[PDB]
């Protein structure tokens, strides 16, 4: 069909195959194949229990990969119920993908920056951290060890800075994996 529709279909397929499980993949692929799809339609095609699609539909709505319509009709047998329709809103969905991956990159930068300030120390007895700025208020009279304010225990070294290269590698491995997303 329309080439931009093909591109957004492949983008939604890629993000549901990457960041979501196989049942999510099946539900969103059914949504991309049949444009609108009610709850009985998902049940008939996928043989998925109502309680099983519960977390699936809840996650897909909370990420806005699919959206819901609350229309009820009048069938000839007059046993009408307020059924729900599941479909895809392409611009809101792609905008959600951009916002999610963008701010994910943003606080990955924040996490590696927080790793990039020097490590400081932490007290194993009280399980509380103390950075280098306030450890020098807690150094001893012998001027050798930082002693905890409560436990009075010599402070041990943390690892915020030894893992900076590991965080950079994880960032790189995120980026080369999400290269199709940015191209789309």
């Amino acid at each position: 069909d329309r080439p931009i529709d093909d591109i957004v279909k492949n983008l939604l397929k890629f993000v549901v195959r990457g960041f979501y499980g196989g049942s999510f993949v099946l539900v969103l692929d059914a949504i991309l194949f049949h444009s609108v799809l009610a709850e009985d339609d998902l049940k008939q095609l996928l043989s998925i229990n109502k309680t099983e699609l519960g977390p699936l539909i809840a996650r897909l709505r909370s990420d806005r990969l699919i959206s819901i319509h609350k229309q009820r009709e009048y069938p000839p047998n007059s046993k009408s119920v307020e059924r729900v329709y599941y479909y895809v809103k392409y611009p809101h969905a792609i905008d959600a993908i951009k916002w999610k991956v963008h701010q994910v990159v943003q606080r990955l930068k924040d996490d590696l920056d927080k790793n990039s300030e020097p490590n400081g120390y932490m007290c194993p007895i009280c399980l509380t951290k103390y950075t280098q700025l306030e450890a020098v208020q807690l150094l001893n009279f012998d001027r050798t060890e930082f002693l905890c304010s409560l436990c009075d225990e010599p402070l041990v070294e943390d690892d915020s800075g030894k893992k900076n290269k590991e965080k950079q590698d994880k960032l790189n491995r995120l980026m080369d994996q999400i290269q199709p997303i940015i191209d789309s």
Partner: protein, 171 residues
């Protein structure tokens, strides 16, 4: 760094010093409560300038304690560190966590993460020191250090130093 600033302090006089030389008692308690006293707002206050004319106005009696509260305004030399400022000093202690440098009245502790990697601890020396391929840093050694972090409490100020920048270190 050293500054000169207008300062104001609320000082409390016990009623036993309500004599004809109450102003002299006020000035002496100003001396041994301000000279060398550390405040985080205005830095280490070192010496009080213009001792002949110190602004002392009327002192309010506290309604329950019965003591007199004077709002004394004075001129004093202070020493306030700032982040990112290069100061000189002398080393007074060394350890495996780092070493403290003495600038003014304040000890700036330089952590072991903030020296060049060629420079390493040597505790076998007496006193223990830091040795590199080109220089040694020991006690009573002239050294130039940049302050890149300052914490200031109500009555205590502590600073963090680093010599990893070029054209720093021993002088």
């Amino acid at each position: 760094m050293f500054f000169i600033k207008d300062l104001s302090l609320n000082i409390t006089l016990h009623p036993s010093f309500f004599g004809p030389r109450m102003k002299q008692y006020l000035k002496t308690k100003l001396l041994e409560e301000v000279e060398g006293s550390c405040t985080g707002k205005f830095g280490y206050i070192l010496c009080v300038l213009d001792y002949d004319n110190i602004d002392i106005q009327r002192g309010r009696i506290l309604p329950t304690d019965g003591s007199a509260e004077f709002n004394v305004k004075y001129r004093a030399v202070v020493f306030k560190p700032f982040k990112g400022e290069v100061v000189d000093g002398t080393v007074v202690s060394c350890s495996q966590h780092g070493f403290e440098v003495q600038v003014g009245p304040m000890k700036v502790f330089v952590t072991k993460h903030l020296m060049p990697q060629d420079l390493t601890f040597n505790a076998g020396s007496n006193p223990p020191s830091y040795q590199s391929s080109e220089d040694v840093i020991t006690i009573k050694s002239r050294i130039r250090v940049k302050i890149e972090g300052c914490i200031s409490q109500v009555s205590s100020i502590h600073a963090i130093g680093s010599i990893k920048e070029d054209y720093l270190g021993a002088i």
